[PDB]
C-alpha cells in the first residue's frame, strides 16, 4: 500500500493533473476572446 | 481606429461641396442683388441724359 500512497496515488493525481495542464490551453483560449477574437471586435470599431 | 474616419469625414464634406454651389454658386443676395444698384445707374444715366 506504501507504493500507491507514496507513488501510484501521485500517479493518479497525475491522471487528475491533465485538467491542471489542459486548463492552460482552455483558459488561454478564454484569453483568445480578449486576443484573437478581441482584436477583431476592435477592428469592427474601425468598420463602424 | 484613428484613420478609419477619413473616407466618411470626406462624406461630411461632399455636401459641404454641394452647399458651396448655393453660397459660392447660385447666390441671390450677392450676385443678382447687383441689379438693385446697376439698374439705378442705367436709369440714373438715362434720366440724367
3-state secondary structure of B35: helix
Method of determination?
cryo-EM
Q: Measured in Å, how far apart are chain A's first and last C-alpha atoms?
A: 66
d(C-alpha A29, C-alpha A27), whole Å:
5
3-state secondary structure of A18: coil
On whether any CB of chain B is under 8 Å from the CB of A25, the answer is no
Show the cell assigned to A27. Answer: 483558459
- How near does any CA of chain B get to the CA of A34, in Å? 17
Q: Which residues make Cβ contacts (< 8 Å) with residue B4, sequence separation at least 6?
A: A45, A46, A47
3-state secondary structure labels for all residues of chain B:
CCHHHHHHHHHHHHHHHHHHHHHHHCCCCCCHHHHHHHHHHHHHHHHHC
On whether any CB of chain B is under 8 Å from the CB of A46, the answer is yes
Amino acid at each position: 500500500i506504501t507504493i500507491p500512497k507514496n507513488w501510484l496515488d501521485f500517479g493518479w493525481d497525475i491522471m487528475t493533473l491533465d485538467a491542471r495542464q489542459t486548463m492552460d490551453n482552455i483558459e488561454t483560449i478564454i484569453n483568445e476572446f480578449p486576443e484573437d477574437f478581441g482584436t477583431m471586435l476592435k477592428s469592427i470599431d474601425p468598420r463602424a | 481606429k484613428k484613420g478609419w474616419d477619413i473616407l466618411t469625414k470626406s462624406a461630411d464634406m461632399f455636401i459641404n461641396d454641394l452647399t458651396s454651389r448655393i453660397d459660392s454658386g447660385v447666390n441671390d443676395v450677392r450676385g443678382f442683388f447687383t441689379g438693385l444698384a446697376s439698374d439705378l445707374n442705367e436709369w440714373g444715366g438715362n434720366v440724367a441724359s
